[PDB]
Design a protein around this nucleic acid. Sequence first.
DNA 1: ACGCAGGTCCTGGACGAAGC
DNA 2: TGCTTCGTCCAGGACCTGCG
Length: 143
Amino acid sequence: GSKSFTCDQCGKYFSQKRQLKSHYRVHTGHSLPECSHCHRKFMDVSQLKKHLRTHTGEKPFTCEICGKSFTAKSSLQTHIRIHRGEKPYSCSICGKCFSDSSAKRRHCILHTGKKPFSCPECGLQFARLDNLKAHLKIHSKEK
DNA sequence: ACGCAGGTCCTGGACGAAGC
DNA sequence: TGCTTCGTCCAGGACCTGCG
Ligand SMILES: [Zn+2]
Ligand SMILES: [Zn+2]
Ligand SMILES: [Zn+2]
Ligand SMILES: [Zn+2]
Ligand SMILES: [Zn+2]
């Protein structure tokens, strides 16, 4: 109030041109925090520090039940639900429940029947890119 | 067999919260 | 306060595993 500068990518408003220029980095990547190891860029320095653990192998979030360690606290939180049998994610179509939110999301796709991954060698179609990768290894073994 | 699909956890963008 | 840094959620994906 008032804001006269607009981003031509997401439409967000800004009161000063310097504010728009700083925000525009998220679309172009220019001058974003850049990892010195791999030179990929991230939205802020905290996301870069998280990414640094991919190079060091540091896993600072340890499960006190089994002793395994994880790179992110969210992953530890998801892992703890396995020990406690906590399955809060359920498919609304068939009722199958999961402790992992991605396992639930991946399962629900099967009710659509879509198989968008087609083997370039024989044309066999798969709902999962994983199954296509493993399938192509059979062609490599046959050849 | 091997297609199928669930188990598991790593990676990072999204975005409001907290820091300074 | 306003820009920076953080915590966290969440989506996606890589690799693993057993069933029928
Ligand atoms: Zn924008
Ligand atoms: Zn890096
Ligand atoms: Zn554990
Ligand atoms: Zn279902
Ligand atoms: Zn094939």
